[PDB]
Design a protein around this ligand. Sequence first.
Ligand code: NA
Ligand code: NA
Lengths: 124, 129
Amino acid sequence: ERLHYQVGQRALIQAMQISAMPELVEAVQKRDLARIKALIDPMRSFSDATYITVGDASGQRLYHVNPDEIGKSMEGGDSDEALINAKSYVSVRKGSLGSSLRGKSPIQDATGKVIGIVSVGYTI
Amino acid sequence: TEERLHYQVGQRALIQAMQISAMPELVEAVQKRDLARIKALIDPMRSFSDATYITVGDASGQRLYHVNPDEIGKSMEGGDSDEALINAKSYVSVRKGSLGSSLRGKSPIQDATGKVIGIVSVGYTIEQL
Ligand code: NA
Ligand code: NA
């Protein structure tokens, strides 16, 4: 149906655009959690998304809306297509914040190697 | 009340313009007027979007980047950039640009003092809706 397609498209384009920012690639390479927060807090401000998560190459959270969730594993079971196969896609799963529609895209270094992931989501 | 597709396309156009205009990389490239560096940042942003175009203008609305390189160095078209360039507002608008009628989201680019130094416009031609 049109609604979940249209919202999914908005989520996916944010994930693809944000994950490609040279500043974020570098902050992830350095594991600089404060710099990641400085980059993503404004991106959430300017979006109607419920959340934006950043994970490292193993799907451990580098940034979450709730700081207590940083340093724990991402939830829902739908990150491997981005982390392993470098695909960008829409998915629906139940994370820590409840059931949501999310767009996901890998973060990649200069060689193409996956170093992280961005997930941008809207609760149902 | 706006029709569903009108609203949904406006929302993603507006969010792209707000997000892209706030990227530290683009703020610096605009400050330095480095046209090659602007191109290097915006080309990938367009490749990852269903938008018809993305235009970047300086503080006076002269184009620093356009999908048609022949349009770089000429004034933006439509007459709907002042609220962003002067009042620092972000909004959705409909006007005829060089590419034909389009629905576009606009947002200012600002330096660390809040001063407006440019504009991002992300748009969808009506023909293509
Ligand atoms: Na990506
Ligand atoms: Na802006």
